[PDB]
């Protein structure tokens, strides 16, 4: 987070959660939130998605304690489970601000005490929040930020009407709260909300090829932690009905990685020690969406008819840089920018520099 508008204290708290970086798509959300802009972001459930809004909002508030104070931030989540995770993430990176979590199927007593004592960041489900507005205990007239998290799930559950009622209280045109909308897909209801509640100058973060062509990222990671980071990149960059190829050197690396719990459910391997008939079947299956993650060695990948994919991952810097560039060309479906990730170890640091010289390319070192 060097030259990121985050305090040293916050960076130390993030380290305590094993957060040492934000993926570029998350890093882009940070700047839009930090700059005060209204936003529609496209990302699914993840650790870094919550931090994309939590870190810049917390920094803002820390810069800006009366008993019974009204919240400054409202985060609506569709379930008790999701609300509890968002609240915990805020609470883990701020020891200064009062963080509260309000959901249904629970008594009012504890929630009443939080409101009596004062709240800075309020996380909750629409039903319970609406109830507290109605009973006159919750003040949403002093909000500065509103986050509508997992709008897809929220709408699927039938909350659209209740969310519209809640927003109608906080957005009574000038000096309205900063509005942040998050989802994995962008339904009709998302832009209908933006058209009414959001400023005409609202931003969008979704990976559609906006004069970039192809992203080349570099991740410094010890081999023992690579599988957890690989799952995280797929969750962040690839989506539902997503195509991802992971390239390895050794057949054991590809086999073990495909068998590894991080992606075991969605992954399938392709190496020399697999019969040709099965290698044929498996590639055909990948093409016709039987599974979403193909873990193949760089050897078996030579000459193999690979389709257009969302994300290309390298376990270590590529020795055949020529093949790496060809695969970059065959990345980025449905008008979206292609993501090319290269994992490297401290010992493989110069090995990644060779790729850059040989290809005449610059990796976003994250
Ligand atoms: Mg076919």
Author numbering: 188 to 251, 255 to 362, 365 to 558
Paste lines from the article.
RNA helicase DDX21 plays vital roles in ribosomal RNA biogenesis, transcription, and the regulation of host innate immunity during virus infection. DDX21 is composed of three domains, including the N‐terminal domain, the middle D1 and D2 domain, and the C‐terminal foldase domain. In summary, here we reported multiple sets of crystal structures of RNA helicase DDX21 either in ligand‐free (DDX21‐apo) or in complex with AMP (DDX21‐AMP), ADP (DDX21‐ADP), or a nonhydrolyzable ATP analog (AMPPNP) and a 15‐nucleotide poly(U) ssRNA (DDX21‐AMPPNP‐U15), corresponding to different unwinding states (except for DDX21‐AMP).
Therefore, we deleted the linker loop partially (GKKTQ; residue 401‐405) and generated a new construct (named as a del‐loop mutant), which helped us obtain a 1.8 Å resolution crystal structure of DDX21‐ADP and another DDX21‐apo structure with 3.1 Å resolution. Here, we have shown that the DDX21 helicase core adopted an open conformation in its apo‐state, and the success of crystallization either without the linker loop or del‐loop constructs indicated the vast flexibility of the open conformation in solution. When DDX21 was in the apo‐state, the RNA binding pocket was closed tightly. Three motifs in the D1 domain sterically clashed with the modeled ssRNA molecule, including residue Gly295 from motif Ib, residue Asp321 from motif Ic, and more significantly, residues Met347 and Phe349 adjacent to Gln352 which interacted with U4 in the RNA bound structure. Comparison of the structures of DDX21 involved in the unwinding cycle revealed that the two conserved domains (D1 and D2) of helicase core unambiguously showed an “open” to “closed” conformational change between the apo‐state and post‐unwound state.
